[PDB]
Symmetry: C2
Subunit: 128 residues, 2 copies
Amino acid sequence: PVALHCGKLFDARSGRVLGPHTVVVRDGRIDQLISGLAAVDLRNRTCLPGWTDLHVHLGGESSPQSYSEGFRLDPIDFAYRSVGYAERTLLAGFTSVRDLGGEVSPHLRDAVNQGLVKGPRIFAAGKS
Amino acid sequence: PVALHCGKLFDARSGRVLGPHTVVVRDGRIDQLISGLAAVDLRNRTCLPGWTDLHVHLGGESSPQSYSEGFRLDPIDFAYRSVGYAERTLLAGFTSVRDLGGEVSPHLRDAVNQGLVKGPRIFAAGKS
């Protein structure tokens, strides 16, 4: 249970930035939206919903060695890299993603959902 | 049947350079060694026996891509490269070599012995 006090709120449905608002969060959902208990001071910030990236591949990253590591590395090493990838993605403001390829992301999604590692909400495609 | 006239001859057994000599070749062997018919004029040159390299790998060559081509290429491409490798080795003065690794060299040796391609006399080790 935390109350959020922020100076401006962006209304996604309308596409307009409103004024001061107070957001009350209990049980992980939004309960009240008073316009005009733990408290977080965001009165010098703009309120937005979390962003969704609909096309990512959290199981790897492009590099000059990307076309030779496949024959020498295992998916476990790629999972160890994906831990940092997912943390960096979450900390940039993206609370959900849609993964469109790769067989490490269904496992990363399970690990994130169980709380073992930090990351966004993953919708995984598995093998293309 | 060709007679060779060269100004100086290197005697491998003794290790000394001698004077003018005439070498008569019939049937692929040395028959006469007159000291002091087709003719080749080498009177401004030094006569030596063909050289032997006891450690070569005619089936490949080092390159920045040598650690990734193995998973993408076939031995046929390496044979096509070995054709030029063997020609260049023969033209540098090495009439025989000892190949100490590689499974393309037993086939290159057969091809050279049958006269299909140019190269030195190959003693191949096969797989190490």
